[PDB]
Design a binder for these strands. Structure first.
Ligand code: MG
Ligand code: MG
Ligand code: ZN
Lengths: 177, 160, 97, 94, 49, 41, 38
RNA sequence: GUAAAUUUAACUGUUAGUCCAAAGAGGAACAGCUCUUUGGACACUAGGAAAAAACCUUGUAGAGAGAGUAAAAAAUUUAACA
């Protein structure tokens, strides 16, 4: 590259601000890819001692989607250590109280359990809705693609495809429906 | 008229991955010929600089360049400062082109020239074995022989 | 019309096989950023313009929180270390290339 | 002189001045600096890749922590390319 | 050396990734064809004796 | 004359890259006018 | 209601309904037949 | 197919034993229970089953910033009846 040594080092080890969207995405897949980016495992110069994490800015965290009945099954447990500090809240209740807590907890769980985890969480940025602070928006690079594909409700189908899909059966003329 | 086997377009009527069609063999072969000729004329003209190679040596694979140093973990039956030819070149490349062996490139195509410049010993290595409550304790000190080779030159020839 | 990978971010990769079939030739010239894809470079009447040299001394706490906010870290990196570690550090480290 | 950079051996002050002089003396339009790549910008650790173009043709690129130092580095890269003392150049023949 | 190329020789590594992707596509094509179509340009095996 | 002590990295090259050392913007596509994600322009 | 593992119809007016994820035997004429799957 | 065996000479040390599989006995067709037999392993290495004696993979010793593998990750969601 014929760069000078110091600018070359700076370019190689610079931090990148990635953008990620919630909005009908699974918190787990969001957390997996965000954790990869935060650890810096996506870089080929990666090493645990090289401090090569990147900033991850996740938005619409209020609009995540859980598969199955996870909203009512999944229980988050904590303990304020005073006798009886054991609290357990379903995913619905936790989401209602804090709109970013679920994604934050998922990323925290997926991060490696060492002393760099809190630094990585410090580089992670979460926002419940469309609004993003201007400095962060001016820092952003590379909105990453969403893991899920948003299956496109029936009323969102166009007439061309509606009529291109064949009709499967012939109803009787005398059925009330 | 629907063909006997037509599936209406559903989410999983077709594989999720995109359909890929490979180039036809004849046109593709002529394309390979043109590409190889272009790289060959690049080599003939000399439109390259600072070659690098991946070379098999002493059971190891080394990515070397000219003016390089490597440390081989054994003696090599060579006097100091002796020029030898490294031959088992898995890969040679430069900017804008690289040549891949299957698995080795022809010796008419590339030469690696190196020079034995040092014959030394490693720093002492400690082998200590210990098993507790059984009085088990052994200590050994070893010094593996070593050879420092300087990669002098990587040369390619027009032979594609 | 078939390319193994998208051909627009690092280099224009062209794979080839020699006639004998014994070696593979790869042609990879760099891809240059388009000028169109770039972006332009961003841009007291009576007295001296006295240089505005104020340096408020922050006590250790608020100081460390300001540094941690600035660099997106925690406070532990900024808290100091003892003489044992300070002397154990190598002040003449080996330096290759 | 084996393994050092051109501007590590021969110190220069204004690479942009030297570069524009060389382009003028070989009849090339003056280079235009543009922000090819940018990361951060509001933080304390930004990355700026500034490219030098001539007639809308990229002649050089350089990274930096500030736009000005990135532009200076791009000027140095252009000088290295023009004088041929580049990193990937053909090594010396002994 | 694969990691060394990924870090220091990015264009060569992209060439390698392209070759591997092409070999994977040729494998998919042969598997779907299931007949006796030509083996494929980069699927050819150099034999030693 | 060098010391017989531990030698890191049993290879020493001074020109480790010829195609340019990897930086995060290698293998990264450029965009129209270099617009940032979700930029209102 | 009485908790049962095996629900049985004791009347011809008894009917099985699955509510709240559990099966129930409801009888409007003989409310003593109310049964809850456990 | 293999390379050990028997004898002669000279002695020490071990002779308070555990799990697993199998055939039994006692006991509750209890026990990380007790008692025999056959065979492993442990009382020696390394990998796996979360940690790990006894389960599974593997043995003969060093250096290597190479490579091929062994064992090796649990699956399941149920009640209409003329
Ligand atoms: Mg017992
Ligand atoms: Mg062995
Ligand atoms: Zn009833």
């Amino acid at each position: 590259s014929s760069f000078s040594r110091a600018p070359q080092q700076w370019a190689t080890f610079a931090r990148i601000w990635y953008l990620l969207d919630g909005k009908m995405q699974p918190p787990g897949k969001l957390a997996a890819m965000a954790s990869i980016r935060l650890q810096g495992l996506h870089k080929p110069v990666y090493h645990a001692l090289s401090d090569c994490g990147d900033h991850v800015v996740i938005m619409n965290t209020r609009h995540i989607a859980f598969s199955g009945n996870k909203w009512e099954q999944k229980v988050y447990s904590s303990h304020t250590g005073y006798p009886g500090g054991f609290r357990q809240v379903t995913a619905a209740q936790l989401h209602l109280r804090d709109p970013v807590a679920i994604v934050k907890l998922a990323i925290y769980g997926m991060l490696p359990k060492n002393l760099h985890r809190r630094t990585m969480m410090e580089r992670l940025h979460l926002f419940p809705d469309e609004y993003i602070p201007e400095d962060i928006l001016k820092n952003l690079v590379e909105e990453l693609p969403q893991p899920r594909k948003i299956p496109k409700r029936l009323d969102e189908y166009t007439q061309e495809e509606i009529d291109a899909f064949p009709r499967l059966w012939t109803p009787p003329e005398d059925y009330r429906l | 008229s629907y063909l006997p086997g037509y599936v209406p377009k559903t989410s999983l009527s077709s594989p999720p991955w995109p359909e890929v069609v490979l180039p036809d063999p004849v046109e593709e072969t002529r394309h390979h010929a043109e590409v190889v000729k272009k790289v060959n004329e690049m080599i003939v003209t000399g439109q390259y600089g600072r070659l690098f190679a991946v070379v098999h040596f002493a059971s190891r694979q080394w990515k070397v360049t000219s003016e390089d140093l490597i440390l081989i973990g054994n003696e090599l039956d060579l006097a100091c400062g002796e020029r030898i030819r490294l031959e088992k070149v898995l890969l040679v490349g430069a900017d804008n082109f690289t040549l891949l062996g299957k698995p080795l490139l022809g010796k008419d195509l590339v030469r690696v020239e190196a020079t034995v410049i040092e014959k030394t010993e490693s720093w002492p290595r400690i082998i200590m074995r210990f098993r507790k409550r059984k009085n088990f304790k052994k200590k050994r000190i070893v010094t593996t022989p070593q050879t420092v080779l300087r990669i002098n030159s990587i040369e390619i020839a027009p032979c594609l | 019309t078939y390319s193994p990978l998208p051909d627009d971010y690092n280099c224009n990769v062209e794979l080839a096989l020699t006639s004998d079939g014994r070696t593979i030739v790869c042609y990879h010239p760099s891809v240059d950023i388009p000028y169109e894809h770039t972006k332009p470079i961003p841009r007291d009447q009576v007295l001296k313009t006295r240089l505005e040299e104020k340096v408020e001394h922050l006590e250790e706490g608020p100081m460390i929180e300001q540094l941690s906010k600035m660099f997106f870290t925690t406070k532990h990196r900024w808290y100091p270390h003892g003489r044992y570690h300070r002397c154990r550090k190598n002040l003449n480290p080996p330096k290759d290339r | 002189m084996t393994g050092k950079e051109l501007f590590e051996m021969w110190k220069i002050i204004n690479p942009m001045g030297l570069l524009v002089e060389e382009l003028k003396k070989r009849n090339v339009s003056a280079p235009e600096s543009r922000l090819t790549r940018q990361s951060g910008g509001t933080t304390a650790l930004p990355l700026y890749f500034v490219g030098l173009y001539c007639d809308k043709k990229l002649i050089a690129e350089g990274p930096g922590e500030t736009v000005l130092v990135a532009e200076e580095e791009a000027a140095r890269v252009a000088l290295r390319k023009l004088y041929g003392f580049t990193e990937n150049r053909r090594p010396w023949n002994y | 050396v694969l990691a060394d190329l990924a870090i220091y020789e990015p264009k060569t590594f992209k060439s390698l990734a392209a070759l591997a992707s092409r070999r994977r596509h040729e494998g998919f094509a042969a598997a779907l064809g299931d007949g006796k179509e030509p083996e494929g340009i980069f699927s050819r095996v150099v034999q030693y004796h | 004359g060098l010391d017989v002590i531990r030698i890191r990295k049993p290879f020493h090259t001074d020109n480790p890259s010829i195609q340019g050392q990897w930086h995060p913007f290698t293998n990264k596509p450029t965009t129209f006018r270099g617009l940032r994600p979700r930029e209102v322009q | 209601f009485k908790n049962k593992t095996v629900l049985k119809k004791r009347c011809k007016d008894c009917y099985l309904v699955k509510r709240r994820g559990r099966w129930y035997v409801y009888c409007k004429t003989h409310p003593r037949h109310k049964q809850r799957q456990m």
